[PDB]
Amino acid sequence: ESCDEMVHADSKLVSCRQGSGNMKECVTTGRALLPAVNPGQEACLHFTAPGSPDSKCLKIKVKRINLKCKKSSSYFVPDARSRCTSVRRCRWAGDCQSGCPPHSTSNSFSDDWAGKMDRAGLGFSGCSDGCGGAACGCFNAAPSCIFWRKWVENPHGIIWKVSPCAAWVPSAVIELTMPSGEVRTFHPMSGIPTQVFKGVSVTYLGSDMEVSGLTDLCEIEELKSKKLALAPCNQAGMGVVGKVGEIQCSSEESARTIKKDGCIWNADLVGIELRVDDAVCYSKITSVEAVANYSAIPTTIGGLRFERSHDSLGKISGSPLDITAIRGSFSVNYRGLRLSLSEITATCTGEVTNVSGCYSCMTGAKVSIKLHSSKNSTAHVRCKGDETAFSVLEGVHSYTVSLSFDHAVVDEQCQLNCGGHESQVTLKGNLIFLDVPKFVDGSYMQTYHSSVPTGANIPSPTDWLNALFGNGLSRWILGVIGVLLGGLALFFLIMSLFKLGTKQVFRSR
């Protein structure tokens, strides 16, 4: 589409050579700054070489500006169950004289338990004593050694993805297109490197917007059913039992199994209960829908309306009413990149065909320009009031661009030049005025609002008071005279009617 906010920060900053025989370049390095733009615009970065007449540009596309948070840590919390078993034996020797562990023996496995498995998981090797008598199983009124082992299992295999975060910094999406032809997308952060791709390190800056009631919130998501919910989650390994933050593990594939070497649990997560050689285990782990302040996918806590935006690397968003933030300018840094230049530009000449759009407003005024040349794309339009750059194709085609004007009757003479050749163009048409749209029920904001032009807010005597009757060349005086005569006639008629009414009301009472 169209483009605006040119920079031209590091023009003529190359140290190339003949260029592989005919014309080539090596690298261009510098630093520039891109101001804030409305959602659905393009910021072009036009380079200039001392030898070549013109060069290509670098367009920056922004679609949505959502309120997301950073990624402090990532883990998976699987669901667990209650599994336990025991065994009843007799002393029958000197191994169980008084107690089972003499001083510190915790290995309560006599090469018989099922703990030596890959699906067993985490547990605690506990033990207790027994009783004596014919009903207790032995022939000695003395405590008998009775071992017990408990663990946790996961038959279903439901996997959860929790990511604690407490920053909630503004962010947006960027659809960057390299001058070579490659088009990729990435999500920049407010101060975090965005995985620089071939030198370009364009980052986004915010305004540090405060939150109303966002203190302990996370972005726990489900994988199988793709269900999202907002609930306060735990912190890193050093945690407390009582809320979310139960037995975790290393990775996602290691979450189906609760085995050791990757799974982390502090203490007191499964209880043991036994009366007479039973060793029954009760469940104490709370599910995700058990803590307080458990929200759902649609959340309207405070002024923010947290929706579920389909996007990679993040599924949490939200957009309040029109905010009109202060600034959202970017910062672009270069490290290394190549760009080929033709420097074989020939005669090119275009003209204006149509013109339409709003007044000085958000969408602006779109103007269609038709060109014809042999070169692929060598053009740079420059005029007063606004500057717009775009790309063309080989042959004769039609293109639509948008410019910013500050006058209803657009009748000027702009200069158009493609590559090295220059010409003159003219624009003539009628424009209209559109204000900021109003809010309607049933509609919710999706990403954000950038800015609305509400500066003048005053009627202009030039545009107004004209289209009611017309406009010739020197008939304005006659029109004013006719307006005055009609006004005087209507005044006399109204006065006569009022006098007749007063005369009728006074007499004949």
Binding site for ligand NAG (CB under 6 A): 213, 232, 292-293, 342, 353-354, 368, 376, 394, 398
For residue 259, state whether it binds a copy of itself (rule: CB under 8 A).
yes
For residue 257, state whether it binds a copy of itself (rule: CB under 8 A).
yes
40, 99, 157, 385: which one contacts a copy of itself (CB under 8 A)? 99
Q: How far is the CB of 134 from a copy of itself (least distance, A)?
A: 14
Q: How far is the CB of 96 from a copy of itself (least distance, A)?
A: 10
Choose among 24, 21, 154, 181: nearest CA to 78: 154
Choose among 39, 35, 36: nearest CA to 363: 39
CA–CA separation, 309 vs 312, rounded Å? 9
For residue 277, state whether it binds a copy of itself (rule: CB under 8 A).
yes
For residue 275, state whether it binds a copy of itself (rule: CB under 8 A).
yes
For residue 116, state whether it binds a copy of itself (rule: CB under 8 A).
no
Q: Which residue, 234 or 378, is less far from a copy of itself as judged by CB?
A: 234
256, 308, 375, 421: which one contacts a copy of itself (CB under 8 A)? 256
231 binds, among a copy of itself, ligand NAG, none (CB under 5 to 8 A by kind): none
Q: Which residue, 249 or 431, is less far from a copy of itself as judged by CB?
A: 249
Q: Across the chain, how many H-helices and E-strands are there?
A: 1, 24
Q: How far is the CB of 368 from ligand NAG (least distance, A)?
A: 6
353 binds, among a copy of itself, ligand NAG, none (CB under 5 to 8 A by kind): ligand NAG
| Region at 120 (left for phi over 0; alpha for psi -120 to 50; beta for the rest) | alpha
Q: How many residues contact a copy of itself, by CB under 8 A?
A: 30
Residue 488 has φ and ψ, to the nearest 5°, of -65, -40
213 binds, among ligand NAG, a copy of itself, none (CB under 5 to 8 A by kind): ligand NAG
Q: Candidates 257-265, 387-395, 444-452, 486-494 — which segment interacts with a copy of itself by CB under 8 A? A: 257-265
Q: Which of residues 278-307 bind a copy of itself (CB under 8 A)?
A: 292
For residue 252, state whether it binds a copy of itself (rule: CB under 8 A).
yes
38, 125, 128, 404: which one contacts a copy of itself (CB under 8 A)? 128
424 binds, among ligand NAG, a copy of itself, none (CB under 5 to 8 A by kind): none
Beta bridge partners of 409: 430
30, 35, 101, 213: which one contacts a copy of itself (CB under 8 A)? 101
DSSP string, 238-291: S--BTBS--SB-SSSTTTSS--TTT-B--S-SSEEE-SSS--EEE-----GGGS
Q: Which residue, 62 or 341, is less far from ligand NAG as judged by CB?
A: 341
Q: Candidates 96-104, 281-289, 359-367, 471-479 — which segment interacts with a copy of itself by CB under 8 A? A: 96-104
Residue 271 has φ and ψ, to the nearest 5°, of -100, 160
Reduce the secondary structure of 429-461 to three states and give it as a string: EECCCCCCCCCCCCCCCCCCCCCCCCCCCCCCC
Q: How far is the CB of 233 from a copy of itself (least distance, A)?
A: 15
The neighbour count for residue 172, using CB atoms within 10 Å, is 21
CA distances from 312 to 49, 183, 308, 309, 315 (A): 38, 17, 12, 9, 7
CA distances from 161 to 177, 223, 229, 238, 248 (A): 33, 7, 11, 19, 10
Reduce the secondary structure of 303-345 to three states and give it as a string: CCCECCCCCCCCCCCCCCCCCCCCCCCEEEECCCCCCCCCCCC
111, 112, 118, 208: which one contacts a copy of itself (CB under 8 A)? 208
CA–CA separation, 68 vs 445, rounded Å? 16
110, 250, 356, 502: which one contacts a copy of itself (CB under 8 A)? 250
Q: Which residues bind a copy of itself (CB under 8 A)?
A: 98-101, 127-131, 136, 143, 146, 208, 223, 250-254, 256-257, 259-262, 274-277, 292
